[PDB]
Amino acid sequence: LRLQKARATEEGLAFETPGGLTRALRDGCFLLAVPPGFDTTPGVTLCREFFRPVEQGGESTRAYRGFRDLDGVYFDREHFQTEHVLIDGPGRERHFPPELRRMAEHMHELARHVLRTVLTELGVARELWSEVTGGAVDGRGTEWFAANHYRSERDRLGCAPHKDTGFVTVLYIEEGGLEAATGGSWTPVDPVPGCFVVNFGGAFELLTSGLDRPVRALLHRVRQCAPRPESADRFSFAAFVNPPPTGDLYRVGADGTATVARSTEDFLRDFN
Ligand SMILES: O=C(O)CCC(=O)C(=O)O
Ligand SMILES: [Fe+2]
């Protein structure tokens, strides 16, 4: 039922639970302590504001509203409760206020630290990390940030079932509703105070399917949120470390060699 829990150290991940990283790789997810001094306020503010007009709200948070009017970053899902902002690095440079930019950067830093820690533990040669991940390990992949608002007034599922497409996702949640497919059933992934949820995506699963401990990409969904006042709607925000939009990645062989190449576009294609 319950997830492994770790804290990020300078050297990697210190797991406080017995299953350690081995169990977390099988689970496709684990709990990660929010680092000391990390400020979640910008993300919570964005999730309460991004879908409202700039004129409708206080002046102090004007930079957090009006994302419906930007081009290519706001998405209203027609058959689900979620509406969201999905934005890459250059978009955040142009459209996020500095404190929000800093928090997203800190979350991507954590996600890259997780990626490096798992590559270390699986025995991937240090000199091939950049090649194998298309530079995502060094912060030169596509680094997506998502802010999700679950509109509980919609009589729909919260979020479609899916696997994340990239390597590592660092997710902030405060409410139940997230579920993971284990066996032929959905299992709840509930929030734990003082923790992020971390999950792995399809690119990490593709990279490692031949290793002694393959990384599983978590198949997950969000169940329909029960109706409640909008100011108390379920929200989440997350940073995703993905391969770059073009180029080859490389599957890792049993002896640590970066072996066969895999096309990022054929991968995204066969994904969806
Ligand atoms: O809201 C959640 O708990 C899940 C969010 C998610 O799966 C995503 O944004 O990719
Ligand atoms: Fe997801």
Author numbering: 6 to 277
Question: How is this structure described in the published paper?
Answer:
Here we report the mechanism of three Fe(II)/α-ketoglutarate-dependent dioxygenases in bicyclomycin synthesis, which depicts the natural tactic to sequentially hydroxylate specific C−H bonds of similar substrates (cyclodipeptides). Three αKGDs (BcmE/BcmC/BcmG) catalyze site- and stereo-selective hydroxylation of inert C−H bonds in BCM’s (bicyclomycin) cyclic dipeptide scaffold, one of the simplest peptide derivatives without additional functional groups. Our hypothesis posits distinct regulatory mechanisms: BcmE employs steric hindrance, BcmC relies on inherent reactivity, while BcmG utilizes a directing group to control C–H hydroxylation. Although these three enzymes share only 35–42% amino acid identities, the overall structures are similar, and r.m.s.d. values are 0.70 Å (SsBcmE vs SsBcmC), 1.07 Å (SsBcmE vs PaBcmG) and 0.87 Å (SsBcmC vs PaBcmG), respectively.
To investigate the effect of the microenvironment of these three enzymes on the site selectivity, we attempted to determine the crystal structures of SsBcmE, SsBcmC, and SsBcmG from Streptomyces sapporonensis. Despite the extensive screening, we only obtained the binary or ternary complexes crystals of SsBcmE and SsBcmC, with Fe(II) or/and αKG, but failed for that of SsBcmG. As a result, we determined a collection of X-ray crystal structures including ternary complexes of SsBcmE, SsBcmC, PaBcmG (with Fe(II) or/and αKG).
